[PDB]
Design a protein around this ligand. Structure first.
Ligand SMILES: [Zn+2]
Length: 198
């Protein structure tokens, strides 16, 4: 895998702001540890994730965060294209929410959306006190932005690789051969030009 670089914007909604008792510091330690974990998991693919911006919605949410994860994701996507990309540019943005999403969904993202002004977006729920667990979900969702599918464990031969549809009790920090071929195919076939330079 040739070197790639993602400028990632992470935005924390108001609900998560109140959960951590309005403490930005506490939010920031969580977010930097997460970025460290993500980079750790993306190292074998030669992708460098750089936290280009952390926006915490402390006054109020700038979009209505709804339990329906696909409706929230789409609202966020437009807000990125429409507002966020106008102030500071980034290759991808993920919303971290404390909101309980419908049907035990803890994360959602647009497949092959990397670099797109509307689609390079993702959503993950701060569902665990453990930063590593929330970081595995963010890595997984980032995996979909980069064209990765779930693992058909049967033929991918992995039980708890990053792309398993259900997050394991003890996720491994590894990508399956299947995920690597998908990412390889993403680069080859779509080649997002925004991730070429650092
Ligand atoms: Zn998934």
């Amino acid at each position: 895998f040739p070197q790639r670089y993602i400028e990632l914007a992470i935005v924390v909604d108001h609900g998560m702001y109140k959960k951590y008792n309005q403490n930005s510091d506490k939010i920031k330690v969580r977010v930097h540890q997460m970025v460290n974990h993500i980079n750790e998991m993306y190292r074998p693919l030669n992708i460098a994730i750089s936290l280009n911006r952390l926006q915490i919605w402390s006054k109020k949410d700038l979009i209505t965060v709804k339990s329906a994860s696909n409706v929230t994701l789409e609202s966020f996507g437009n807000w990125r294209e429409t507002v966020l990309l106008k102030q500071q540019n980034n290759d991808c943005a993920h919303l971290l929410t404390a909101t309980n999403l419908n049907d035990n969904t803890i994360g959602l993202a647009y497949k092959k959306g990397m670099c797109n002004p509307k689609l390079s977006v993702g959503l993950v729920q701060d569902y665990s006190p453990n930063v590593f667990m929330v970081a595995v979900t963010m890595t997984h969702e980032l995996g979909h932005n980069l064209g990765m599918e779930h693992d058909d464990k049967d033929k991918c031969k992995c039980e708890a690789c990053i792309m398993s549809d259900v997050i394991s009790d003890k996720p491994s920090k590894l990508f399956s051969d299947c995920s690597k071929n998908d990412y390889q195919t993403f680069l080859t076939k779509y080649n997002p030009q925004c991730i070429l330079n650092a």
